[PDB]
């Protein structure tokens, strides 16, 4: 019960397949089933990411912030010409190189806690692994985590102001971090502008953010209720991938997104006015019950697993390769190293949603961790 994730778009997904609401005089049209969210990802014309910056997220963000994120806030055909300059940086976490490192960092991390017996795990774990992790992805030193760590769980702004000092910093004197490689990659033959350069970064720091966080800590939880699943993983590791997979699927962590609609036309036969605001609610299309077998369940070695917790077609998860690495390397580790969990206290995120609460993951959790 204490890590169960509930579907509160059940009754709505099965009888209408939408839901609505309110944000900031900008009202969203959310789609509800697997079938429609994917065919609505696939049709960028009718449904585009290319808006004023800011508007296809919810809460929107049009009031914060003036940069359109790259690639994330363009449309086809310039979307792929931009995702192909980025695409190989994101490919990264799959050398082995990489990946040993990343395994001392979670070594470390499991070790430690295994020490101090009980922890909070959001702030004490999660964000301390999120933000090391992010120093590989990024190819900047290790201590650049701290200055990461502090942020914590006009104040956008310190992030973006933080962004524009790197972008400056890698002009003057370039290296091998991300920002001095952006600066020197080429779109149609031109370098990157340090605008398009902060496009790609300020989406980098905040999509890969608190989705692990909410992953890493989701997936402890569940594993301290579960310890039939814990000795699987231990005992059976050809199964952590499609774990994974699965933790993704009904976790969900990004829980929607938006897109504007460019036209008049129908879904579900609802009708959606040009310029209002649909939403891809990967979440409820996740626990589809015409799709997944025991949705509402964890599988955790479930092969037949079409989710779309990283989305779906043109603009589907960048950070995908790097979470996963985190998540797989994360369980293995957890396997191997610590017999059993309790859970001792906690308070619940609940996404504020109209309707619809949704439970998101954890403020703060504290658990012990009990070493073999
Ligand atoms: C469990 C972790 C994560 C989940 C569930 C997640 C989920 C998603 C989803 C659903 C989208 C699709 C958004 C849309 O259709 O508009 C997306 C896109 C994206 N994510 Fe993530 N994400 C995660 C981690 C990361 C991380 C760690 C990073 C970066 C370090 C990242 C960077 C991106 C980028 C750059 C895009 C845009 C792709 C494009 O526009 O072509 N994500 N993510």
């Not at 609505?20 to 009202?27: H, I, L, R, Y």
């Not at 990264?92 to 101090?116: D, G, H, M």
């Not at 897109?259 to 979440?283: F, G, M, N, P, Q």
């Amino acid at each position: 019960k204490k890590s169960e994730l509930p579907d509160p778009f059940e009754k709505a997904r099965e009888s209408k397949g939408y839901g609505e609401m309110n944000d900031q005089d900008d009202p969203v049209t959310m789609l509800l089933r697997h079938k429609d969210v994917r065919k609505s990802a696939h049709n960028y014309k009718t449904f585009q990411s290319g808006a004023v910056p800011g508007r296809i997220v919810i809460p929107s963000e049009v009031d914060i912030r003036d940069t359109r994120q790259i690639p994330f806030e363009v449309d086809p055909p310039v979307h792929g010409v931009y995702r192909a300059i980025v695409e190989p940086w994101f490919k990264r976490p799959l050398q082995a190189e990489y990946q040993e490192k990343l395994t001392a960092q979670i070594s470390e991390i499991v070790e430690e806690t295994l020490l101090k017996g009980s922890v909070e795990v959001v702030t004490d774990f999660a964000l301390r692994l999120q933000s090391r992790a992010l120093t590989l992805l990024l190819n900047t030193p290790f201590s650049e985590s701290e200055t990461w760590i502090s942020w914590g769980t006009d104040k956008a702004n310190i992030l973006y102001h933080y962004i524009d000092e790197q972008i400056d910093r890698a002009s003057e004197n370039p290296g091998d971090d991300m920002y001095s490689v952006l600066l020197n990659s080429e779109f149609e033959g031109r370098k990157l502008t340090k605008e398009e350069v902060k496009g790609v970064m300020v989406l980098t720091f905040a999509g890969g953010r608190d989705t692990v966080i909410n992953a890493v800590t989701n997936s402890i939880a569940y594993l301290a209720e579960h310890p039939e699943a814990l000795e699987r993983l231990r005992k059976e590791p050809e199964i952590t991938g499609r774990a994974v997979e699965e933790m993704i699927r009904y976790f969900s962590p990004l829980t929607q997104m938006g897109r504007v609609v460019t036209e008049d036309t129908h879904v579900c036969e609802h009708a959606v006015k040009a310029d209002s605001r649909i939403s891809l609610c990967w979440a409820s299309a996740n626990r589809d019950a015409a799709v997944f077998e025991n949705p509402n369940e964890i599988v955790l070695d479930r092969k037949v697993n079409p989710h779309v917790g990283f989305g779906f077609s043109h603009h589907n998860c960048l950070g995908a390769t790097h979470a996963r690495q985190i998540l797989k390397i994360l369980l293995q580790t957890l396997a191997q190293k610590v017999a059993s969990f309790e859970i001792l206290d906690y308070k619940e995120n609940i996404e504020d949603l109209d309707h619809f609460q949704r439970k998101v993951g954890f403020h703060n959790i504290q658990i012990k961790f009990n070493p073999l």
